[PDB]
Amino acid sequence: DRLLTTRNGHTTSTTQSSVGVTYGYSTEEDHVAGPNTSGLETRVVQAERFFKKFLFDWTTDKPFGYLTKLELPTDHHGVFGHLVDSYAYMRNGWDVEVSAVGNQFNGGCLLVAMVPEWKAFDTREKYQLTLFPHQFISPRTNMTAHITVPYLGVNRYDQYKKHKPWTLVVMVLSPLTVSNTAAPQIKVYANIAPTYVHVAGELPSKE
Amino acid sequence: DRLLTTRNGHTTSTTQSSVGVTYGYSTEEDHVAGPNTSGLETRVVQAERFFKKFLFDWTTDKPFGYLTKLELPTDHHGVFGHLVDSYAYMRNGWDVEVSAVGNQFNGGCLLVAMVPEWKAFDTREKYQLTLFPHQFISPRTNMTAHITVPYLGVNRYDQYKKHKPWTLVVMVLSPLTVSNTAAPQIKVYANIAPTYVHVAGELPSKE
Amino acid sequence: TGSTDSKARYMVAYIPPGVETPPDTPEEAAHCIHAEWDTGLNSKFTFSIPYVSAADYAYTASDTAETTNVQGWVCVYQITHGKAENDTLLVSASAGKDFELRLPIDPRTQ
Amino acid sequence: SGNTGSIINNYYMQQYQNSMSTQLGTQNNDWFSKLASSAFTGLFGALLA
Amino acid sequence: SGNTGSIINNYYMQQYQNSMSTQLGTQNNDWFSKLASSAFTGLFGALLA
Amino acid sequence: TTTTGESADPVTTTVENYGGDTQVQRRHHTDVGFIMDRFVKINSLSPTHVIDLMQTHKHGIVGALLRAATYYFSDLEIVVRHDGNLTWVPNGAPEAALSNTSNPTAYNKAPFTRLALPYTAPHRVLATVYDGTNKYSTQLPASFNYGAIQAQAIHELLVRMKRAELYCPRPLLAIKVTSQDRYKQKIIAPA
Amino acid sequence: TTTTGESADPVTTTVENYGGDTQVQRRHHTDVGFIMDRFVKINSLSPTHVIDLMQTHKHGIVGALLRAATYYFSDLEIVVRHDGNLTWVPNGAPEAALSNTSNPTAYNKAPFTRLALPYTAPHRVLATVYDGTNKYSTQLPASFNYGAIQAQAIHELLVRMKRAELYCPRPLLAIKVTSQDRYKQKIIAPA
C-alpha cells in the first residue's frame, strides 16, 4: 500500500499506486517579498486548488520519443485565470499529478517531467530528459506520477501572458504493449494545482 | 481642520471637511464563522477597496423628499463582482463615503443614510428617515458624509443575486440654494468599499 | 465492484446552488469542492457532502414551486478507466457526525 | 424521559404509574451507540496538505 | 420578563414552555441604549450665569 | 447647546440649561418585551391558516410596533376558537401533514384553545420587510412563518409574542392631521 | 478515506478531510424514547377491541417508526371516546371477563377517557414481526397484545407508547419517487 492522498484547498486526490512525490530543484520557495513589488503583493489562497487537463492517448503506435507538452500556466477558467486578467504580475509554483490508467497487463513506460524554459528538443536530447525533475509511469508498477516544483525565473514575479516558466512534458520511453487482457489504450490526464499564488499590480476594469 | 483620511486596501480617500464617521447599529461584525458554512468560508481581502458610483445632480428644482437610492451590492466590475459570480454565498459590510461638492456660498441640506431591507417610503415616512444610520451634508459646513455599517440579515451569509440587505439613500431635506457666487448645481458621488468580505461555496466554471 | 484487472479513477463534486445546471464535465466541476480517487486495494471511498446554505437549517421536503434544487447537486464523474467496461460502482449514504434533524412531523397520507 | 416535562413530582406512586422493570444479573447496552462511535474517522494512507 | 406576573414557579419545564436559545461565542448588546446614553448633555461654549 | 448638526451625533439638552430640575422617569410601559406581550387579533382566517405575524393589523398597537422594526424574534402563544379538533404543524411542514393526528392536535374543548408555541423558523431571526430581488428558485419569504393550523372551521385567532426582541427601528406614524392645529377626538369622561 | 468496504466496518468521514469544521449537533428530536412518546390513532374499532400496536397505521410517524424495529417494549396510555362504561382487561384474559365491573372499569365522563396502562404480556419483549413456522397448537402470536377494552360503543382510540425501547432496526421507507429528480409537494407558506 503506497497510498497517498494530496490536498490543495478544498480539493483532494488519492492514489493507491503512488511511487512518492518528486520535488524539483528545491524543497521550499524563494522569498516572495522582494524589492520589485514594493510592499504591494498579496497571496490568493482561493487559487490554490486542482484543475484538470487532458494530455493525450497513449496508444501502441506512438514510439519512443513521442512527446506531449503543456506549458504552464495554461488556459484557466477559475479564480486562477481571473487573477491573470486582474493583476499585472504573479508568481506561484506547481503541484502536478499525472494518470495513465490502463491495467497491470499492459506494458510500456512514460516519462513525466517538469521543464523550466521550454525549447523543442532534438531527438538525441530526449535521452537526457531525466536531468529535469521527473518520474515514470509503468503499468506493472504505478498509475500515477506526482511532481512538485517551485516558482523560478530571471524575474521574481512574472507576466504569464508573455512568458511561461514551467512546462509539463510526458514522453513515451517504451511503447505501450497490449494483450488480450490489457487495456487497448491509455488516456493520459493531468491534475494540477498552483501553489503559493501571489499577485501584484491591480489592473483597471475593462468595464 | 476636520481632516480625515480613510484607507481600504491600496486605496485612500481624504477630506478636509469631515464631520466624523457614523457607525450604524454596531461597531463590530457578528461572527463570520457560523454553522451554516461548515468550515468552508474564506476571507478575500483583495475585494476590500473603494469603487465609485455616481448618484445624481443636486439641482435647485428638486424639492424636499427628492430621493435617490443605490441598493448594495451594485454592479461591480472588479474582484468583488467576480466573487459574486464565483461563490454561492457571501457576506460583507460597507464603508460608505458620499460627496456633494459645490461651495460655501451654496445652501440646502442633504440627508444620507444607509437603510436595511429597503421599501419605497411613503412621503410622511420621510420625516423619520433619521432612525436609520445617517449623516448630513450642508455646504456651509461639509462636503462629505461617511457611514460605516456591518453585515446583517436573517441569514448569516447571503446570495446577493437574490437579496440586497443594505441600500444607500440620499435625500433632499432642504433644497439647494444658489447665488451669483455659489456653484450652479452639485453632482453627488459615492465612494464605497466592502468590508470583511467572506465567500463560501465555490461554484463551477462556465467554461 | 470491478475485477482485479479493471481499473478506474473517479471524481465526486458538490455543486452548490447558484448555477443554472450542473456541469457535465470534470473540468468545469473541478472548480468546486471535489475529490478524486482511484481503484486499488481498498474498494470503498467515502466523501462528505458539506452543509453550506444561507439559513442555519433546511427543509427536508421540497416545495412544488422549487425549480432548481435549493441545496445544489452532487455529480459523480469517471475521469478514465482501463478495461473497466460494464463494471460497477455501488454508492450508499449515511449521516455524518454533525447531521441533525429537528421538528417532528407526521406527513404521510393515512 | 422523553416527551414529559412536568416540574412537579408525580401524585401517584411509581409502582402504579408504571410497570416495575426487574433484572436478573438501564445500562450502556446501546449496541448502536457503541457501533456508531466506533466508526473510522481518520484517513487511510499518507497525507500531503 | 415583560407582562408576566406569576409569583409561583412554572409547572412545565423550561425546555417545553419556551424554545431554548443557543449561542456561538442576553448581553448588553443594546445599541440604542448605548446610543442614547452617549448623547451630549452639556453646553458647548462659555457660560455666564 | 449648539452643536455640529451634520455629524448626526445625539444631543439631549435638559431644562437645567435655563434653571430647571430634570425629574425621575419610569419607562416600564415602553419596554419592548413588555409592550409586545399582549394578544392581538388576526383578521383574515380560513379552515387552514398559516401563522404569519404580518397578517396583524398595521395600526394596531402590536402590528404598528412590530412594523417599526426591521428584524424580530419571539416565541408565541395562540388562542383559537374552532370547530372540531385543532392541529398545528411547525414551520417547514408539507400542508398535507395538517390532516394527521400525531402532529400536535388539541381536541375541542369549549370555549377556545390557548397554546404555547416555539419559534420554529430556520433563520436566526425574521424580518418585517425583505428586499429580495427575487428570493425564489411586498412578498416575504415563505419561510417567514410560525407554522400552520387547521380545524373544521376557525372562527377566531389571537396571537401573542413571547420573549420579543426587536432590531433596527423604522418609521412609526401617527394619524395624519388635517385640522389646523391638533387632532381632536372624544376622550372618555363621566356622564 | 479509502477502506475495505467488504468488512462492513463503519466509516464516518468529516468535512475536515478537505478543510472544513464539523459542527455541533443536537439530536433530541431523534431520541427513540421521546419520538415514540405521542398519541397515535387506531383506525379499526369495535365495541370489543384488543389493543395491538400493530393496528397502528404503517406510514404514521409512530407506526412507521415502530415497524422499523424488530423488538420493542413499553408501557401505554390510552384515550377512548366511548358510550357507556369502559372496561379494560389485561393480556391473557378470557374475552368473557370484559363484562365484569370489578375489572378496571371507568365510568363514563365526558368527553373521553384517558388511562395509564402497564405492559402486561408474558414475554420479556414483543415483536413487530415473528417468523413462526406455526406458533400454534403475517399472523403474530395472540399473546402479543396490551389487553382489551369494551364499552357499549367505541368511537375513538388513541394510543401512546410510554418508556419505549426499540431493538434490531429494520427498513424504514420514504414515499417512492416517480418524478425525475425530487418528490415535490406544497409546503406551508403565508398567503
mmCIF file of C-alpha atoms in Angstrom, chain B residues 7-195:
data_model
loop_
_atom_site.group_PDB
_atom_site.id
_atom_site.type_symbol
_atom_site.label_atom_id
_atom_site.label_comp_id
_atom_site.label_asym_id
_atom_site.label_seq_id
_atom_site.Cartn_x
_atom_site.Cartn_y
_atom_site.Cartn_z
ATOM 1 C CA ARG B 7 -7.859 53.703 3.773
ATOM 2 C CA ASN B 8 -9.238 50.445 2.340
ATOM 3 C CA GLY B 9 -6.694 48.137 0.796
ATOM 4 C CA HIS B 10 -4.494 50.005 -1.649
ATOM 5 C CA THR B 11 -6.966 52.873 -1.935
ATOM 6 C CA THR B 12 -7.234 56.010 0.136
ATOM 7 C CA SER B 13 -9.541 58.968 0.323
ATOM 8 C CA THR B 14 -9.031 62.116 2.336
ATOM 9 C CA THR B 15 -11.406 65.019 3.129
ATOM 10 C CA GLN B 16 -10.701 68.376 4.695
ATOM 11 C CA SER B 17 -14.303 68.962 5.722
ATOM 12 C CA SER B 18 -15.372 65.800 7.525
ATOM 13 C CA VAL B 19 -17.899 65.715 10.300
ATOM 14 C CA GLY B 20 -16.777 62.330 11.536
ATOM 15 C CA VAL B 21 -17.925 58.841 10.734
ATOM 16 C CA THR B 22 -21.284 57.399 11.720
ATOM 17 C CA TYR B 23 -21.303 53.758 12.723
ATOM 18 C CA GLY B 24 -24.618 52.051 12.184
ATOM 19 C CA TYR B 25 -26.307 49.539 14.515
ATOM 20 C CA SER B 26 -22.962 48.129 15.610
ATOM 21 C CA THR B 27 -19.322 48.846 15.891
ATOM 22 C CA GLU B 28 -18.091 45.303 15.227
ATOM 23 C CA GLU B 29 -19.145 42.425 12.977
ATOM 24 C CA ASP B 30 -21.136 39.367 14.138
ATOM 25 C CA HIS B 31 -19.367 36.001 13.977
ATOM 26 C CA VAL B 32 -18.439 35.295 10.347
ATOM 27 C CA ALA B 33 -17.899 31.592 11.094
ATOM 28 C CA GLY B 34 -21.244 30.060 11.844
ATOM 29 C CA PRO B 35 -22.631 26.555 11.417
ATOM 30 C CA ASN B 36 -24.221 27.287 8.045
ATOM 31 C CA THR B 37 -20.903 27.384 6.234
ATOM 32 C CA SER B 38 -19.397 24.390 7.949
ATOM 33 C CA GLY B 39 -15.762 25.347 7.916
ATOM 34 C CA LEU B 40 -15.647 26.325 4.259
ATOM 35 C CA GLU B 41 -15.766 30.110 4.228
ATOM 36 C CA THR B 42 -12.709 32.251 3.443
ATOM 37 C CA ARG B 43 -11.914 35.966 3.541
ATOM 38 C CA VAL B 44 -10.990 37.737 0.320
ATOM 39 C CA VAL B 45 -9.105 40.845 1.286
ATOM 40 C CA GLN B 46 -8.418 41.787 -2.339
ATOM 41 C CA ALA B 47 -12.046 42.947 -2.531
ATOM 42 C CA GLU B 48 -11.836 45.364 0.338
ATOM 43 C CA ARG B 49 -11.225 48.570 -1.523
ATOM 44 C CA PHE B 50 -13.046 51.579 -2.906
ATOM 45 C CA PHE B 51 -15.203 51.637 -6.045
ATOM 46 C CA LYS B 52 -17.167 54.531 -7.432
ATOM 47 C CA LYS B 53 -20.710 55.289 -8.410
ATOM 48 C CA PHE B 54 -22.448 58.499 -9.480
ATOM 49 C CA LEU B 55 -25.652 59.222 -7.577
ATOM 50 C CA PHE B 56 -27.398 62.286 -9.040
ATOM 51 C CA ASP B 57 -27.352 66.030 -9.712
ATOM 52 C CA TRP B 58 -28.423 68.140 -6.746
ATOM 53 C CA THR B 59 -30.277 70.973 -8.509
ATOM 54 C CA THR B 60 -32.477 73.805 -7.243
ATOM 55 C CA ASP B 61 -35.646 72.284 -8.634
ATOM 56 C CA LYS B 62 -35.502 69.053 -6.632
ATOM 57 C CA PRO B 63 -37.694 69.606 -3.523
ATOM 58 C CA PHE B 64 -37.748 68.204 -0.048
ATOM 59 C CA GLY B 65 -38.342 64.499 -0.308
ATOM 60 C CA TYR B 66 -36.471 64.024 -3.586
ATOM 61 C CA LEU B 67 -34.768 60.749 -3.058
ATOM 62 C CA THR B 68 -32.095 58.734 -4.852
ATOM 63 C CA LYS B 69 -31.117 55.245 -3.677
ATOM 64 C CA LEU B 70 -28.483 52.679 -4.554
ATOM 65 C CA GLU B 71 -29.070 49.076 -3.488
ATOM 66 C CA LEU B 72 -25.918 47.269 -2.402
ATOM 67 C CA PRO B 73 -24.168 45.439 -3.681
ATOM 68 C CA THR B 74 -24.469 47.068 -7.030
ATOM 69 C CA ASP B 75 -22.950 46.150 -10.361
ATOM 70 C CA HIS B 76 -19.251 45.674 -9.678
ATOM 71 C CA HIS B 77 -16.622 45.102 -12.365
ATOM 72 C CA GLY B 78 -13.689 44.341 -10.099
ATOM 73 C CA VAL B 79 -12.786 41.472 -7.845
ATOM 74 C CA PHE B 80 -15.866 41.977 -5.747
ATOM 75 C CA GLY B 81 -18.033 41.430 -8.779
ATOM 76 C CA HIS B 82 -16.094 38.339 -9.746
ATOM 77 C CA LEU B 83 -16.661 36.964 -6.255
ATOM 78 C CA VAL B 84 -20.407 37.236 -6.669
ATOM 79 C CA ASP B 85 -20.172 35.066 -9.797
ATOM 80 C CA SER B 86 -17.776 32.522 -8.338
ATOM 81 C CA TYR B 87 -19.324 31.748 -4.974
ATOM 82 C CA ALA B 88 -22.765 30.693 -3.962
ATOM 83 C CA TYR B 89 -22.680 32.683 -0.706
ATOM 84 C CA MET B 90 -21.066 35.868 0.545
ATOM 85 C CA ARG B 91 -21.239 38.416 3.349
ATOM 86 C CA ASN B 92 -19.506 41.728 3.998
ATOM 87 C CA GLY B 93 -20.248 45.149 5.484
ATOM 88 C CA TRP B 94 -19.865 48.604 3.892
ATOM 89 C CA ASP B 95 -17.687 51.644 4.414
ATOM 90 C CA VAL B 96 -19.511 54.450 2.625
ATOM 91 C CA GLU B 97 -18.381 57.919 1.802
ATOM 92 C CA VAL B 98 -20.580 60.365 -0.122
ATOM 93 C CA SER B 99 -19.510 63.923 -1.835
ATOM 94 C CA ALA B 100 -21.594 66.693 -2.624
ATOM 95 C CA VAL B 101 -19.065 69.329 -3.586
ATOM 96 C CA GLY B 102 -20.271 72.789 -4.571
ATOM 97 C CA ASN B 103 -19.076 75.718 -2.439
ATOM 98 C CA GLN B 104 -19.516 77.655 0.794
ATOM 99 C CA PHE B 105 -21.912 80.061 -0.925
ATOM 100 C CA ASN B 106 -24.492 77.351 -1.623
ATOM 101 C CA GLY B 107 -27.255 76.454 0.790
ATOM 102 C CA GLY B 108 -29.509 73.481 1.365
ATOM 103 C CA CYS B 109 -29.055 70.155 3.105
ATOM 104 C CA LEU B 110 -28.946 66.505 2.051
ATOM 105 C CA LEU B 111 -29.616 63.520 4.286
ATOM 106 C CA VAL B 112 -27.507 60.473 3.552
ATOM 107 C CA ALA B 113 -28.466 57.242 5.232
ATOM 108 C CA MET B 114 -27.882 53.514 4.960
ATOM 109 C CA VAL B 115 -31.112 51.530 5.146
ATOM 110 C CA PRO B 116 -31.503 47.818 5.874
ATOM 111 C CA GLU B 117 -34.150 45.966 3.791
ATOM 112 C CA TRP B 118 -35.386 48.797 1.546
ATOM 113 C CA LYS B 119 -39.042 49.513 0.797
ATOM 114 C CA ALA B 120 -40.281 52.612 -1.114
ATOM 115 C CA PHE B 121 -41.122 55.179 1.543
ATOM 116 C CA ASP B 122 -44.416 56.998 1.899
ATOM 117 C CA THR B 123 -43.794 60.721 1.907
ATOM 118 C CA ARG B 124 -44.834 61.006 5.589
ATOM 119 C CA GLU B 125 -42.313 58.305 6.479
ATOM 120 C CA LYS B 126 -39.504 60.505 5.054
ATOM 121 C CA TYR B 127 -39.774 62.702 8.164
ATOM 122 C CA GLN B 128 -38.485 59.789 10.229
ATOM 123 C CA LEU B 129 -35.699 58.619 7.931
ATOM 124 C CA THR B 130 -33.256 59.682 10.653
ATOM 125 C CA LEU B 131 -33.969 56.493 12.595
ATOM 126 C CA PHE B 132 -31.517 54.932 10.154
ATOM 127 C CA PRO B 133 -27.739 55.330 10.320
ATOM 128 C CA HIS B 134 -27.198 58.736 8.779
ATOM 129 C CA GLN B 135 -25.283 61.970 8.354
ATOM 130 C CA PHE B 136 -25.990 65.285 6.662
ATOM 131 C CA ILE B 137 -24.239 67.350 4.044
ATOM 132 C CA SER B 138 -24.719 71.132 4.178
ATOM 133 C CA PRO B 139 -22.468 73.324 2.033
ATOM 134 C CA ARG B 140 -21.935 75.797 4.844
ATOM 135 C CA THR B 141 -20.353 73.014 6.862
ATOM 136 C CA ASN B 142 -19.226 69.938 4.990
ATOM 137 C CA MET B 143 -18.775 68.326 1.594
ATOM 138 C CA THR B 144 -18.522 64.719 2.716
ATOM 139 C CA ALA B 145 -20.665 62.268 4.644
ATOM 140 C CA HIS B 146 -19.191 58.989 5.887
ATOM 141 C CA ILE B 147 -21.115 55.994 7.259
ATOM 142 C CA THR B 148 -19.841 52.521 8.178
ATOM 143 C CA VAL B 149 -22.190 49.573 8.590
ATOM 144 C CA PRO B 150 -21.938 45.876 9.388
ATOM 145 C CA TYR B 151 -23.393 42.943 7.556
ATOM 146 C CA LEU B 152 -26.806 41.898 8.796
ATOM 147 C CA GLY B 153 -29.883 39.981 7.778
ATOM 148 C CA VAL B 154 -31.843 36.865 8.649
ATOM 149 C CA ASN B 155 -29.124 34.687 7.107
ATOM 150 C CA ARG B 156 -25.550 34.709 8.355
ATOM 151 C CA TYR B 157 -24.481 34.621 4.666
ATOM 152 C CA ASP B 158 -26.396 35.807 1.586
ATOM 153 C CA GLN B 159 -26.949 35.293 -2.119
ATOM 154 C CA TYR B 160 -26.556 38.807 -3.371
ATOM 155 C CA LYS B 161 -28.047 37.839 -6.679
ATOM 156 C CA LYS B 162 -31.366 37.292 -4.880
ATOM 157 C CA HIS B 163 -31.338 39.740 -1.961
ATOM 158 C CA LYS B 164 -29.692 43.100 -1.251
ATOM 159 C CA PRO B 165 -29.547 43.820 2.542
ATOM 160 C CA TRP B 166 -28.247 47.377 2.519
ATOM 161 C CA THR B 167 -29.281 50.241 0.304
ATOM 162 C CA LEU B 168 -27.723 53.715 0.334
ATOM 163 C CA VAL B 169 -30.089 56.630 0.218
ATOM 164 C CA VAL B 170 -29.510 60.358 -0.252
ATOM 165 C CA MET B 171 -32.453 62.734 0.047
ATOM 166 C CA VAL B 172 -33.073 66.439 -0.249
ATOM 167 C CA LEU B 173 -34.015 67.820 3.140
ATOM 168 C CA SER B 174 -33.819 71.455 2.203
ATOM 169 C CA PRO B 175 -33.445 72.451 -1.477
ATOM 170 C CA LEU B 176 -30.190 73.669 -2.852
ATOM 171 C CA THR B 177 -29.860 77.434 -2.961
ATOM 172 C CA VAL B 178 -27.550 79.259 -5.342
ATOM 173 C CA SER B 179 -26.440 82.852 -5.672
ATOM 174 C CA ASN B 180 -24.125 84.646 -8.030
ATOM 175 C CA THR B 181 -21.134 83.288 -6.191
ATOM 176 C CA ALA B 182 -22.303 79.734 -5.498
ATOM 177 C CA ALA B 183 -21.960 76.647 -7.649
ATOM 178 C CA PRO B 184 -24.943 76.416 -10.058
ATOM 179 C CA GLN B 185 -25.544 72.764 -9.155
ATOM 180 C CA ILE B 186 -23.882 69.955 -7.201
ATOM 181 C CA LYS B 187 -23.071 66.487 -8.541
ATOM 182 C CA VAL B 188 -23.348 63.875 -5.859
ATOM 183 C CA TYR B 189 -20.909 60.928 -5.946
ATOM 184 C CA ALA B 190 -20.383 57.832 -3.806
ATOM 185 C CA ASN B 191 -17.087 56.147 -2.877
ATOM 186 C CA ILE B 192 -17.866 52.769 -1.402
ATOM 187 C CA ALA B 193 -15.808 49.868 -0.102
ATOM 188 C CA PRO B 194 -16.980 46.417 1.051
ATOM 189 C CA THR B 195 -15.608 45.282 4.403
#
